[PDB]
Every structure is written in structure tokens, then in C-alpha cells.
Amino acid sequence: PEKKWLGTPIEEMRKMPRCGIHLPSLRPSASHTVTVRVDLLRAGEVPKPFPTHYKDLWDNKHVKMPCSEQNLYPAGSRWELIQTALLNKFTRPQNLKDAILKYNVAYSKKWDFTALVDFWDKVLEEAEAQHLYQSILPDMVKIALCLPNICTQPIPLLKQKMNHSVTMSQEQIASLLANAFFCTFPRRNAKMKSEYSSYPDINFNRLFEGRSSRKPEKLKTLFCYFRRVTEKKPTGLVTFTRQSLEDFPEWERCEKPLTRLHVTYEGTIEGNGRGMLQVDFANRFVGGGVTGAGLVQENIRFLINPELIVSRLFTEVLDHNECLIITGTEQYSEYTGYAETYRWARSHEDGSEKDDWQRRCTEIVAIDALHFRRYLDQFVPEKVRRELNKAYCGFLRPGVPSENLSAVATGNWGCGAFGGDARLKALIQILAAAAAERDVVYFTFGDSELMRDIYSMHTFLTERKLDVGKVYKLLLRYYNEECRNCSTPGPDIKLYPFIYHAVESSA
């Protein structure tokens, strides 16, 4: 009949907050921006900002804030215009359109609001729609205009090559995302913009356009979030860390043993990987590409844990050797389905514990797989190393002892319609985690046959005591003997059968 899970029992895997290191005092440093008063940080209490009063930096190293004195429009304060536009009664979707357009006159022809209109009138029921413009919208306006009182410290841009963290409160994020809803962020809109060309869009204008059925679902999911945040203010902190490694394992010679594996075709990363390092199948432009298009794994996580979206404000396109690590985000929505079948189910009430820094024990890492538009490309040794390096970067924690690292909760990273081979990518992640000295928890999402195969291969390589280097050498043998001279889209003999054969015919 076939089992539901294989390998190590999931309750034997290291998980937060149990496995956690003893956190030192939270404090600002060269590599850590802290936007809250640490001495006044108390459990279940809304964090006070630091500094007390708004300081502005309008430069190329910080986020260009909408409440800045240097944000200008036809010449006067664009922020005071934002205030006059938003301090109005909404009763019809066009009011909100005309409000957002008052400080975006150049995009009146480019920004379509049809999806907003049709959500307002067709999707929402009368009472649901009334509640939106009577309460939710005015409450989002109020927290959006309180931005200079809420976010007082200039937020550094996490540029490529930077190894830097930013710890802010959820309440601060709420105000930033509310601003992103109303499309207040300057310099972020133009097609021929220069400074932020290598950053994803932050303004939510694209969620209002078109005649697609995906749009109302994304709006349901976000309005759920905004409803919660405006009715009951969140009290925790969230950390955003960009990691960028220059040096990587010498994969051919790496002597590190494979680690433990739990593999299952039932469960989810977000549901069953609680307290573990949860992988986000990212786009290099985090949160779903420059544009935010799609309802795929990354898009979904960003919608159900909306606080992740704010990373699009200050996170530059990820390079090959980089990742973004986010600790502390809350789950607000529950969902069903995927892509065209994605549906908002109901609100979620997050019951996870917190660490000493008041961050929820939820660690997500954004690692972008490559898009293999030609199938064979991934077996090319350099492309394997690339995937190895990207995964390793997401899993490695410099200076943290292995017994303090949670298991990695992951799945079919970059696979399916993205072109990656599940069996290869499973092996790549396994090797990467071994080099990082973390155990693996792998979700195959319904594919029971894949669960088996990954399990059999892991067991094979563990019992035969093949280290990372020995396994990686098998991947090179596969390319040379089966891939480089292949005239067909895929080779006659698959990876795993070749690996078994290669090892069984040795010594």
C-alpha cells in the first residue's frame, strides 16, 4: 500500500525554539540595524521606535521614504498631497482609484483598477464590502499616514555583496505595507527608472489590474492580513538578513558525511516544518519576480505571511551566491490549492512561541533555483555546483554550532514547470545540507513514488558511507557518460539507476 513517511521520525529532528542558541542582547552594530528600543522591549507589548522622532535620509544607501521632506511633486510636499488624497471618504472603488492617482498623475493611463472594481462589486458580499470601506480602508489609511511616527529610523538597502541584518517590528511593517498598498513609495514605479531598476516593485498597483481570477484571491488574502493588523496590533519583531558568501566547499573533495532525512508525500513546509528552516522557492527578485506575478510557492507564502512582502522594499536582486533570511514572520491566512486553483480558505491564528528578541520561531530562507528551459543544462557540472552553492548559502550559519541548527524543511525546489529534475534537486539539497551539517525534512507534495526513491537513494549512500565529495563525483560521471553526448532532450538512463549501477560495479 505504501507508507506516508520514510526515514528518521520528524519528532527527532532539531527544531526551534528548543535547539536554539542563547541569543545575546539585541543591539545595533555595523552589521545589524535595529529600529526599536531594545531596553523597552517587553513580551506582548507593541515595541517603541528608536529613535523617538523621525530622522530622514534621502540618499542611495537607504530606502527613499514617502514621508520625506525631499519627496516632491508639482513644487511641494508629496507627502502632504498623499495626506489630502487619503483623508477622504471611500464609498466606491473609483474613489480609491482617484485617491491613489492624485500623487501618481503619470500613471493614470498605465494603472488599471478593473480587478479592484470587480472585487469590490462582484466578489465581496454586500456586508463584506461595506466593512471594507467603512473600517478596513480608513484604518489602513490611518496607519499609513502614521509612518513618520512609526518608522523613525532610515532603512538601509540590502545591496548585493552585503552581509547585513535589519530587525524591525511587525507594527512598522504594517505601516510600510499599508503605504505599499496605496502606492506611496517614490522612485519605484517608472519603467525606465535607474536607481531601483535592480529591485522588485513594492507598490501594490499590479494587484488592481486585469480581468484574471487570480487577483481577487490575492486581495482576499491581503485584506485578511490588514483586517487583523488594524484590529489587533502585532507585538513581535522580524529580522531580515542578507547573506553573501565568497567561498564555498570544494565539492569534489568534501569529506562531510550525509545527514539525517525525513521524507514524506503528505504535509506542507509551512504546516509540518514548524520550528525548522523553511525554504522559499524564490525568484532572484524575492517575493515573485520584479512584478510579483503568479500564484506559485513563493507568491503564496508571501501572501499568507504578508510581512515577507516588505523585503521587496529594500532587497536588491539576489546574485548567484546570495540569499535572504527572514525570522519572525506571522501566518495570517490559510489557503487551499495552487496556481490557478489557489483559494483563500480562512484566517489563521499563529500560535508559535517567541525567542528572547520577541521574534516568532519561524525562519524562512529565500533561495532561487535556476530556470532550466532546456532540461539537460542542469546536469552540466557548473550548473550543479551553482545549485549546490545557492542551497549551501541558504543553509549555512557562520559561527553557529551544528547542534543548534534546526532541520531544513524543503521540497521540490525549482522543479515541475520550472524545469528542474526532482531527483537531482533532492540530491543537491541533501549534499548542501550535509556540508552545512543540517538534517533534511523533505516534502514531495503527493508524489509517493518520489518519496520512496529519495529515501532509497539516501539510505543507499548512507549505508555505503559515501561523503559529499564521493556523491558529487558520481554526478560528474553521470554528465560525462550519459549527458554531454546526448542527442535527445533527456538521456536513456536516469540519474538514480546510474548511481546505483556505478556504485554496485565498483571495487
Numbering used by the authors: 442 to 515, 525 to 957
From the paper:
Reversal of PARylation is predominantly carried out by poly(ADP-ribose) glycohydrolase (PARG) in nucleus and cytosol, whereas ADP-ribosylhydrolase 3 (ARH3) may play a role in mitochondrial PAR degradation. PARG comprises an N-terminal regulatory/targeting domain and a C-terminal catalytic domain. The mouse PARG catalytic domain has a bean-shaped structure, with the active site in a deep cleft in the middle on the abdominal side.
To understand what caused the activity difference between the mPARG E748N/Q and E749N/Q mutants, we solved the crystal structures of these mPARG mutants. Interestingly, while E748N and E749N mutants were completely dead, both E748Q and E749Q mutants still retained residual PARG activities. In contrast, the signature loops in E748N and E749N mutants have significantly different conformation from the wild type PARG. In wild-type PARG structure, Cβ and Cγ of both E748 and E749 residues are semi-buried. Mutation to Asn, which has both Cγ and Nγ linked to Cβ causes a spatial collision. Therefore, the conformation changes in this catalytic loop completely abolish activity of mPARG E748N and E749N mutants. To study the enzymatic mechanism of mPARG, we tried to soak the catalytic residue Glu748, Glu749 mutants E748N, E748Q, E749N and E749Q with the iso-ADPr, which may be the smallest PARG substrate containing the α(1→2) ribose-ribose glycosidic bond to be cleaved by PARG. In all above four PARG mutant crystal structures, we were not able to observe the electron density for iso-ADPr at the “active” site of mPARG. For E748N and E749N mutants, this may result from the conformational change in the active site associated with the mutation. Our work revealed precisely how some of the PARG mutations (e.g. E748N, E749N) disrupt the PARG activity through significant conformational changes in the PARG active site.
